[PDB]
Amino acid sequence: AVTLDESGGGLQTPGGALSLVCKASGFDFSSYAMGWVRQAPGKGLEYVAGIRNDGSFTLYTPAVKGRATISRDNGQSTVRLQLNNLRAEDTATYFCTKSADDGGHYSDFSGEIDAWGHGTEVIVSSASTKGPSVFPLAPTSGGTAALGCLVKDYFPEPVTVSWNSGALTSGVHTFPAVLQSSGLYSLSSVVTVPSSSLGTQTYICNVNHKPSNTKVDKKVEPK
Amino acid sequence: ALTQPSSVSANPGETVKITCSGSTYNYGWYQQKSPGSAPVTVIYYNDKRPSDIPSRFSGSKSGSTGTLTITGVQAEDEAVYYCGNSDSRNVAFGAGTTLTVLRTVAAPSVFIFPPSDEQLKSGTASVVCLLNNFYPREAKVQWKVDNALQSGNSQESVTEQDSKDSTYSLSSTLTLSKADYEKHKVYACEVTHQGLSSPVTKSFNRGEC
Amino acid sequence: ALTQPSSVSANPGETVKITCSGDYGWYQQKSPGSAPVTVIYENNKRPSDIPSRFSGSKFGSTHTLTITGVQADDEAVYFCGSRDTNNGAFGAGTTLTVLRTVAAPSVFIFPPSDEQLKSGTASVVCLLNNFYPREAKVQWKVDNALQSGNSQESVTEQDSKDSTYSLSSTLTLSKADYEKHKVYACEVTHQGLSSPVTKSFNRG
Amino acid sequence: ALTQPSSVSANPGETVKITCSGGSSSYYGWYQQKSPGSAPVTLIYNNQKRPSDIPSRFSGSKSGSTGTLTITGVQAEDEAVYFCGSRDNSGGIFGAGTTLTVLRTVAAPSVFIFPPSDEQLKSGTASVVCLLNNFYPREAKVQWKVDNALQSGNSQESVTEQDSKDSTYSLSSTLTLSKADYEKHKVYACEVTHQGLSSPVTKSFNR
C-alpha cells in the first residue's frame, strides 16, 4: 500500500518561508526519484522541484529558482521542500509525487509518476482566520424536492460538508466555494431527497471547518 | 513546449485519442476530476498502466508525439487529463485536455431558495438559484428583481461531472444587503440552457407560505 | 518554422514579453533594409553595448525576450533565431507597436508638376502625416465620382521620436484623363476623425 | 515529415531535378513506381548508390537535410511516381512521390461512344461508355447529355497512366443508369471538351 502524506502546507505569509515535508510508505524509498508539483487556482499543473534517488541531483522551476531547496532523508523516508521570500503567485495546492524510476532521465520527473498525495493548500497572505455562518436553504412542489445549507463567509479553504453524520450519500452535491469581493468563501451543499420524505425525515448538515476549529450542525426544515 | 488540446469530446463507447507533442521521451498521463483534488496516474512510462486502472486506458509514443487512447469511453472518464514529459531537458506538464462526454442532452431541474429567518437577523440576504443534473456544462443564469436585469452581484459555482450519469449542477447566488431585500418582492431566475426551448423562470414572493 | 507572434503592443515604462516557441537568439531591426542589431546573443547572454532592460529566458522549447521598462528607442521588428528539424532558420518577426494616444493625420494634397505633364503622365499625391493607429482609409473623388483600382498607398514604419505613421496614396492617371476634369478631392477616413477631412484642389 | 513535390514536368532531353526535404537522417533513397499496382524499383539508395540495370542519367545527391534526384537527359520512359525515403525520430518516412510528366505536342482525343449490350439490359442495368483515346494533356471535360440534359452524380471517370512511347493519355467515362431510365430517352450524347479540340466534339447514338 503506497501512501504520500503531505505535512506543513497551510496559511503562510508574504516574504516568509515554508517547510513542506512528505512521508512515504509501502515501497523502497531510497530507489525512486521524488518531486513536488503545484496547481495555482484557476491555472494548470506545474512542476516545482525534483530530487534524484541518491539525492545527488535537483532541478527547480524558473519561478522558484534560487529560493527553493528540495531535500530528502532516505533513512526517514521523507522529502522536505523549503521555499523562501513567498510571493502572492506562490498560492497553489502542493502535491508530493513519486517517479517509478531513479530520475536518470529528465522525463522521469513529470512523465513517469506512479504515486501522488492528497495535497496541501498553501496560501500566501497577511490575513486572519474567520468562522463560517451556516444558513439553511428551506424548500415549490413536485416529485423530488431539494434542500441545502449555505456555508457563507469563511477564510481560508477547505470546508467539509456531510449529511446526517455520513448517512446521506446519494443525491448529495458539494459546490466549490466562490471567493467573494471581501476575500471570504461561500460554499454551498445541496441534497435531492424525495418530496414525501419532507418533514417525516430529519436532515442535519454537518459543516466542519478545520482552520478556525469551527464545527456547526444545522437542521434544515421546510415550511 | 508540450502542446496538448484545450478540449476533446466523444459519445460513450467511442474511442478517444488525446495527443501531446513536443517531447520524444517518457510520457505520463494524469487525470484530475476537479481542480484541487489529487490527480490519479492513468498511464506512466509511455504505455505502462497501473494495476487499479481500467483496461480501456492505453498509451503510445510516435516520434515526439504521444497519444492517450480510451477505447469505449464511460461516465467516470470525464476529467482534465494532463501529459507529462521532459520538454528539452526540462521537466514540464501540458496545458490540460478536458474530457466532456457527449451523452444525450439533459435539462436542469431548477429550484430557487429564499434567505432563512436566521440569515435576515444577521443583516444579509442571499438568494440561491439551484440548477441540477444537466448536459452540457454551457448554461446561462440571469437574475430578475422585480423584472429588472441584475449584473455584477451574482457568483455561480459549477461542480465536477457525475461519475454515474454524467451530469453537471450549478449554484448561482444573488448577494444583497438586508435593506435592498425588503425594498423588492418578486425574485425571478431566468435559466437559459441548450436543452431548453423556453427559458425556465422560477420565481418566489417575499413573505409567502 | 519558428513560431513567433505577428505583433505585440505595450505602453512605455511597462514590461514586454515576446515568445518564440518554434537555443534562441534575438535580433532587432528598426526599418526593413537597415542592418539588424543583436539584442540577446544566446538564451541568457547580452552584448556589452545593449541596455540592461533587455533580458532573455528559455523554458523547455520556448524562449521569452523580456523588455523590463520599454521606451521609444525600442520601436523595432524583433526576430528569433534557432534551429528547427536539422536546419537553421529565423522567426516570422514580432512588430513592436508602442501604445500611445490617438493622433489625427495632417492631410496635404499635391498636384502633378509642370515637368511631369510634358512627359505624358500626371499623378496626384495625397500625403498623410503623423497619425495613430496605422488603420486608415484613403478614397479618391475625381469630380465627385468614386475611384478604385488606380490608387497605390505607401505606409511608413512607426517613428522613433513620437510613435506616428505617415501614408502616401498616389492616383495614377494618363495626361489625357487629367485634363478632362477640374476638381480632385481626397476623402480621408481615420479613427481620430469624426468627419472625413476632404482636401481638394482646382486645375486652374 | 518528408516534403517533396507532387508534379514535375520535363521535355525529352532536358535535365530534371526532384527535391526531397526533411527528416533527421544520414541517407535518402529514391524509388520509382510506373503504375499504382506496380512494385517499387530502387533508383538510388543511400544518397547516391545506384543499383544494377539503372541508367547513368539517374543521379543521387544530398545537401544538408535535403536529398535530390537528378535525371540528366530525360527519356519518355521516365514518366512515373518518384518517392523518396528517409528516417524521422518516429521511423521510416516517405515522400508524397513526385509524378514526372513528360511534355509533348498538343494532341486532340479520339472520341468514341459505346451503347449497353442487349445481354446487359436483361440484367436491369445500363452502362453507357465514352472513350477518349491517345490525347495530350490529361486536362479534359466529359459531360453526359441524356435527351439534352446534364447528368451529374451518376457517372465515374477512369484514367490510364501516361504512355512511354507517345506520352498521351486515355479516359473512360461510365454512365450507369437503370434499364427503364435507358429506354425512356433516345438521344445519348457525350460532349468532350479538350485543349486540342477547337470545338467540343460530341459523339452520340440513338437507342
Next chain:
Amino acid sequence: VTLDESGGGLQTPGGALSLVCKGSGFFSFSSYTMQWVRQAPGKGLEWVASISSGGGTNYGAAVKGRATISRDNGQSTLRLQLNNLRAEDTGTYYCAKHGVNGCDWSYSVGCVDAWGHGTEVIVSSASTKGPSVFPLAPSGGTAALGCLVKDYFPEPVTVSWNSGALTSGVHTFPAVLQSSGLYSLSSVVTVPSSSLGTQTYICNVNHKPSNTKVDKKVEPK
C-alpha cells in the same frame, strides 16, 4: 536476390494475418536488415516494420501494438503477424531488403535496394465475386472496340486481348470501386475498320480469387 512475399489475401476485419517473404539467392541473409512497406489503394508509400541483423524490431506508428515482424534466418524468411485488421490495413504489401553496407538506423527507408512482387492484402467481410463481361462493339480508316468487366471483388482482374497476340492499341483501364462495393474495369482496343470483318477479337478476362476465366467475342451488331 529475389524476395517472394506471399501469404496474404482477403482477410476478415478484426483478425490475424501472417505473410511470409521467401528470400532467395541470399548470401548471409542474417546480415541484412529486413523490412515491410505497404501501399493503400490510391495512396502513397508507408513503412510498416523493420528488423536488424540482431533482431532490431521497429513498427510504423500506424501498426505498432498489434504487429509482429520476425526473421527465420535459417530459411531466409521474413514474417509479419498483424492482428485486429481494419480498412487502413488494406493495400499491397511489399517486402524490402536494406542495402548490404546498412543505413543510419535499421528502421530507415533511405537504404532499400531490393523490393518484392507484392502480396495484396484486402481487409473486408464481403465475399468473392466474379465479373460479367459485356461488349463495346464498333460502329474506313481507324475504329475502336472493347469489353467491360462489370462486377467483381477483390480488385485483381487480368484482360489479355486475343490471347496475348493483340497488345498494340490496347488500353486496359484501372478498375473503379462502384457505389455497391464491387469493381468495374474497362479494357478497350483501337483497330482499323478494314480489319473488322476479317479479324476476330477475343476478350480474355481472368478473375483469380473467384476462378472466372471468361472469354467473350466482341463483334459488331
Next chain:
Amino acid sequence: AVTLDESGGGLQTPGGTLSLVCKGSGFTFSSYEMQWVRQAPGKGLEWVADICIGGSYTGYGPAVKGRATISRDDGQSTVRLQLNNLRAEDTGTYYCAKTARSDYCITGLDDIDAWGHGTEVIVSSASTKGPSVFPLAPSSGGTAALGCLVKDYFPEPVTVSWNSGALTSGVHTFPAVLQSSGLYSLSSVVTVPSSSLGTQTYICNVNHKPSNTKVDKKVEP
C-alpha cells in the same frame, strides 16, 4: 570595434551568377564561423550559408541548395558568396554575420553577435531607367510642407539627403511602390514653418547608384 563591410550592389540578369564579399575588421577572423543572411522585400530573415573556421564545413539554405557557394579568404579576411541560376526570389538586401564564440561551429542561429550594413541585389533583366525628380509645392498658415518625387526609376535603392546631410530634423522617407507599368515611385517630404519661405534654400538631392544620376532639384512655392 567590429566592422563588417559589403561589396557593391548588383542588378544581374536571371539565370546568371552573383558574387559578394564581406571585408571584416576589428576582430580575429579565421577563429569565428561566418554566415550569410538575406532579407526579401518586406519579408523576414532567411539564412543563406554558414562556413566553419578553416573552411572545414559548409552549409547552405533551402532556396540556395545546390546553387550557393561560400569562400572564406583568411589572408584577405573576406567571405565570398557565389550564386548561380538567379531567380526572382533572390532579390533582396544581403547581410554578413559572425558567431559570438571562438572555435565554435554548432548548427543554430542563436549565436550571431555582429552584422554587416547590407547590400542590395535586384534580379531583373530590365535596363536601368534614369531618375526623374519633380518639385512639389503647396498652394497652410503655420506649418508648410515641401518635398520632391522620384518617378519612373529602376532599380532600387535611392539615397535622398536634404542640404547634403545638414537637414535631418522633420525628414520623412517613404518606401517605393511597384506601379502598373512596372516602375517604382519614391517620395520624401520635410516639415518646415511658413516663416522660412523665402529666407532659406531647400534642395532635394537624389542619388541613383545603378545609373549614376545626381540631379539637384530646388523646391520653391
Next chain:
Amino acid sequence: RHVFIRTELSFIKNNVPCIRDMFFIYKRELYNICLDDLKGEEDETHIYVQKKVKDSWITLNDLFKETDLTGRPHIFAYVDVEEIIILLCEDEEFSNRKKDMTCHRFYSNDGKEYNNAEITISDYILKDKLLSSYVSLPLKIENREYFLICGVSPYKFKDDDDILCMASHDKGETWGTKIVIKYDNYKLGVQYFFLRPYISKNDLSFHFYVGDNINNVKNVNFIECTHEKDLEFVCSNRDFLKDNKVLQDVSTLNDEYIVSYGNDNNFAECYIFFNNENSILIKPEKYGNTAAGCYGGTFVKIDENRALFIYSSSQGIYNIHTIYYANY
C-alpha cells in the same frame, strides 16, 4: 633491416576546458569528444564532438544536449571506414542495478551532421559489471563485424567470467551477443580500472590499470586475447615491465607494439619503443613550459605506419607527437 622512425611536434589550442578527452581518427582527421563539466553558478555539462582544423580545436555539435540524460553518461564511441556511431549509456551509482541499460545512439557519415535516438538494452549482459568510457572500432570474429561494450567485476574473493563484453552487429542498436573473456590471472583482492579494448586486424587485446592494495598506485596491464570456439576468448598477460620506467599506453605499427613509458608515476619525461629496439625521448618542455609533463600520454593510430602521441602539459594545450614508423 630498414628502420624508418620520424617524429614532428605540433600544438593545438582548445578554448574549451575538458575534464576528460577522447581522441579518434576519421577520414584521416583528428577528433575529440570533450566533457565540459564545470561546477559553478552558470556552468552546465556539455559533450562536444571537436575536430582539429589548424593549430586549434574547432567545436562541432554538442551531442549531449539531446540526451534526456540527467548527468555524466558513459561514452562508447566507434569508428568505421565511412561512419561514426556514438553512445551515452547510464551509470550504476550505488545500487543502480537497472536490469536494462539506456543509452542514446548518435550516427554520422561526416562527424558533423549527427542524428540521434534513445536505445534501450533491456536485460543487458553487463548487469552489475562496472564501466569505463572509451573509443573503439569494429572487431571481426568469424566473418561478422562487432562493436564491443566491455566491462569488469568490482571485487574478487571467490574463484571463477570476471571480464566480459556485449556486442552489436547492427551498428550498435542490438547488444544480445555475449563475448567471454577468460583472463586467468585475476588474483584474489584486485580491481581493474579504465578497461579499454585495443583492437587491430581483428585481434582482441585489453589495456587496463590495476589499483594495487599494497601500493596506492594504478599499474598498467596489457593482455593478448586468443580466439578459442565461436565467441570464446582466452587472454594472457603480455609483459612490458622496463628497468626504471613505468608502462603507460600501447599500440601497434607494422604489426609490432609501439609502447609508451614514463620515468616515474609523475611523468616528467616519456619514451616510445618501436618493437623494443628504437626509443624516442619526448621532452615536454616545448612551448616554454616549466610546469610540464606527459601524464595521460595517449596513442591515436592513423595507419599501420602513422599514430599520434598526445598529452596536455597544461589546460587548453595539446602536444601532438606525430609518429611514423616503417620496419622493413
